[PDB]
Amino acid sequence: ANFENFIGATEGFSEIAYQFTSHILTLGYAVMLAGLLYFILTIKNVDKKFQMSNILSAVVMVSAFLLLYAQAQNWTSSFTFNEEVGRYFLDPSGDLFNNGYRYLNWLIDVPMLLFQILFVVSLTTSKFSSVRNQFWFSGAMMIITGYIGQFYEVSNLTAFLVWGAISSAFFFHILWVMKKVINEGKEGISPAGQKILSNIWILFLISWTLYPGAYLMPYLTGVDGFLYSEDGVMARQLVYTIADVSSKVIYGVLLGNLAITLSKN
Template sequence: MENMENLFSYSSVQYDIINHVLVLGVGAMMSGLAYFIMTIKDSSPRYRLTSVISSVVMVSAALILFNQQQSWQHAFAWDGNKWNPSATTFSNGFRYVNWSIDVPMLLTQLLIVLGVSGAAFRRRWVGLVVAGILMIYTGYVGQFYETTDITKLLIWGAISTVFMIYICYIVGISIAETNVSMPPKAARLAKALFWLLVVAWTLYPIAYLIPWLSPTPNGMVARQILYTIADITSKVIYGVMLGQLATRLSAAEGYEPARESMKSVIYGRD
């Protein structure tokens, strides 16, 4: 996959920004991993799987972003003035490999924390996972055309976005249905989680469209920044908020370690 990043030469500033942003992504994922391991016992056993899943997501994302950062370093050579393309190519395709692992897990842990169970869980899980995989791989196909046929990039991107909207709709319904039985502060956190997901996931199609919106070196810098911000938001921050929701629900159900944990946070007790 020859992404548009490989068509340009970059100034020292442009090259370094992308390199540093990718390192930031790796650091954020490793920090998230440490957090999820340390807080795993704050939630009752019925919710604890969410911290385990978040930890797996962190490892998966960190490995891919590290691969991206190393690939970026080998894809360009310094000539004393600019960073020029080398014989090695940089590919965003590895991000799609990562998303195909992480998106199903992120959606699964949401259903677990929301307490969706039985036939409803199976139905929603299948719908979300299938839509998630289709969202990722239709976008993946479009990436192959970004340097040769921008119309096909836009068509496949539009198809991918339809699946994204469907996922957000199902997530919204699931949160709305379970909100009525949650304590007020937990319900507000669940709503905030939904809007975080919508905003973070919207960054992905914007980054996807950069080859159409801004086919320039600065555009490529913006794309890597957007992708990495979206990854950090939709994985690390999302996972932290979901873990906090699990802790709040555990406390409301009388789980003592969760009650103790809630005493130490700045927003007080439920």
């Protein structure tokens, strides 16, 4: 199946790798719940014209809280301690670790995260429906092809890499469209608003690039390096969690700050 089950069925996990991963994943969903309350409670601070962004952030928080909670429970319940060896091994009586929860989260959140910026910034020469459709089509194809490649993570590294490269092509199209959105959105707003948009662009670029980084984490030191191990599992789930918080919560906070700044003439 996946790299997590592979390690869990062969080498097992140290108490530390199992506990660290349970805690990071728990922090992930905990932050989404806090984010949910923040976006609901702050909806009254922005003008009505911009409230769709707060609404879409709130919906992303529900998606991410529920699905990361389900992933967290799946992690903790999938491995059981062996006293002889002193490690956690995959439990054949369990469901086994499943990355489906995260990929479904991506399928839901990606279209809403890309769409929500179009309720805060104004385009100039691009059409709203064109940009929206390109975001949605490429976003969906990114996640779908990456999901396909994930099936080959352990069994066929070649297909894993090829499908990931196909997915990356759609990713680069998204980055290209978003860069245009940001540049049109900077036209005729105040310098304070332009500086927030510049920050949004940088946050977007870095935080979205973390996802492919985590997808490749166990192979980033070769076919038998330091990360082809429980340490690469830990690193993968840490980087996902940093990306989750950044791409969903911080991105949303910054858009709301942009909407407040735009209310000032």
